[PDB]
Amino acid sequence: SNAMELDLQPGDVVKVLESAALGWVRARVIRVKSGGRVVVQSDQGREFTARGNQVRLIE
C-alpha cells in the first residue's frame, strides 16, 4: 500500500499508533491541516497529529 507516503484523505479509516501504551488503534483521518499536519481522531474522540510513520492504510 505505502511506505511512509501521505495519501491520507479526510474520511479515511486507518490504523495509527496513537500512543505507546496502546499501540496501533484504529483512527479516522479528519483533515489535513497545517502543511503536513494530519488530523486523525480515534473513536475516543481524541484528535491528534498523525505522520506517515504512525499511519498505515490497509498494510
Exp. method: NMR
Environment class of residue 4 by beta-carbon count within 10 Å: exposed (0-12), middle (13-18) or buried (19+)? Answer: exposed
Indicate the SS3 state at residue 25: strand
For 51, phi then psi, to 5°, come to: -135, 160
Indicate the SS3 state at residue 2: coil
Round to whole Å and give the CA distance between 56 and 34. 20
- Give one word for 11, left, alpha or beta, with left for phi > 0 and alpha for psi -120 to 50: left
- Beta-bridge partners for 56: 15
Round to whole Å and give the CA distance between 42 and 5. 20
18-48 in b/e form (b: 16+ CB < 10 A) is: beeeeeeeebbbeebeeeeebbbbbeeeeee
Q: Which three cell numbers stand for residue 7?
A: 495519501
